[PDB]
């Protein structure tokens, strides 16, 4: 038998509970753009891919 | 008797607040922000009543 | 009682408990997430999306933020490949009234999806 919603008052019943899916810290992935968020002259070298637009 | 007459009632409040702090530490040990867990554990009807207290 | 029905009893009777809970406004978002996973185990994901949508409609900020995150994660994997455009509208609904810290996350996630499958200009 499997339980997932209640928090049993018996600890012996607590052992039966299914381990709930933990979230992922989405902010950690956001950090990569937050590291991109440093205010810099983004032509850091004369990189023509920045200088000339793509298609 | 030399302590305040309400001191044990204050202590009961403080122990209840420490039990809220214990739940906060429990979420931090599991690996989640206690604020985010609480939002997942709130039932909306409490917030409804709160707004009506304001209004 | 919900845990009793899910362990012992039939899918439809168990789901009827959740229906009563939703009508009575009892549900926490965690209970919704439990229900959503339960509906994924019974593989009626369209109902699972309806459950997320109902629980978003009952609740208010900040709480709705995490409900969106779990809902979008589930949708984008199987059905985000299949029918992309509904998620744009769903992102738009998610942005509505959003407090700034959670909104910041949602703007980046939406623009990433716009980079993955839509126009860069958007």
From Swiss-Prot, chain A:
It comes from the Eukaryota. This is Coiled-coil domain-containing protein 12. The chain holds residues 57 to 111 of 166 of the full protein. The lineage of its organism: Eukaryota, Metazoa, Chordata, Craniata, Vertebrata. There is a cross-link at residue 38 (Glycyl lysine isopeptide (Lys-Gly) (interchain with G-Cter in SUMO2)). It comes from Homo sapiens.
From Swiss-Prot, chain B:
Identified in the spliceosome C complex. Interacts with CCNDBP1. It is found in: Nucleus. Belongs to the SYF2 family. This is Pre-mRNA-splicing factor SYF2. The chain holds residues 62 to 116 of 243 of the full protein. Abundantly expressed in the heart, skeletal muscle and kidney. Expressed at lower level other tissues. Involved in pre-mRNA splicing as component of the spliceosome. Residues 5-30 form a coiled coil.
Curated annotation (Swiss-Prot), chain C:
It is found in: Nucleus. It comes from the Eukaryota. HAT repeats lie at residues 9-41, 43-77, 82-116. Signal peptide: none annotated. Belongs to the crooked-neck family. Involved in pre-mRNA splicing as component of the spliceosome. Involved in transcription-coupled repair (TCR), transcription and pre-mRNA splicing. Associates with RNA polymerase II, the TCR-specific proteins CKN1/CSA and ERCC6/CSB, and XPA. Identified in the spliceosome C complex. Component of the XAB2 complex, a multimeric protein complex composed of XAB2, PRPF19, AQR, ZNF830, ISY1, and PPIE. Identified in a pentameric intron-binding (IB) complex composed of AQR, XAB2, ISY1, ZNF830 and PPIE that is incorporated into the spliceosome as a preassembled complex. The IB complex does not contain PRPF19. This is Pre-mRNA-splicing factor SYF1. It comes from Homo sapiens.
């Amino acid at each position: 038998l499997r339980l997932r919603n209640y928090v049993p008052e018996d600890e012996d019943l607590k052992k039966r509970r299914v381990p709930q899916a933990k979230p992922v810290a989405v902010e950690e992935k956001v950090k990569e753009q937050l590291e991109a968020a440093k205010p810099e002259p983004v032509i850091e070298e004369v990189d023509l891919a920045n200088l000339a637009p793509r298609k | 008797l030399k302590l305040p007459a309400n001191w044990e009632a204050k202590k009961a409040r403080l122990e209840w607040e420490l039990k809220e702090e214990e739940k906060k530490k429990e979420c931090a040990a599991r690996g989640e922000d206690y604020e985010k867990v609480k939002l997942l554990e709130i039932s909306a009807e409490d917030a409804e009543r709160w707004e009506r207290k304001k209004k | 009682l919900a845990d009793l029905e899910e362990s012992l009893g039939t899918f439809q009777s168990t789901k009827a408990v959740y229906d009563r809970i939703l009508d009575l406004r009892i549900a926490t978002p965690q209970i919704v997430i439990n229900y959503a996973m339960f509906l994924e185990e019974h593989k009626y994901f369209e109902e699972s999306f309806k459950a997320y949508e109902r629980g978003i409609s009952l609740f208010k900020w900040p709480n709705v933020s995490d409900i969106w995150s779990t809902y979008l994660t589930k949708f984008i994997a199987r059905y985000g490949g299949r029918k992309l455009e509904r998620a744009r509208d769903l992102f738009e609904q998610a942005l509505d009234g959003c407090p700034p810290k959670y909104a910041k996350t949602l703007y980046l996630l939406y623009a990433q999806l716009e980079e993955e499958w839509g126009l860069a200009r958007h």
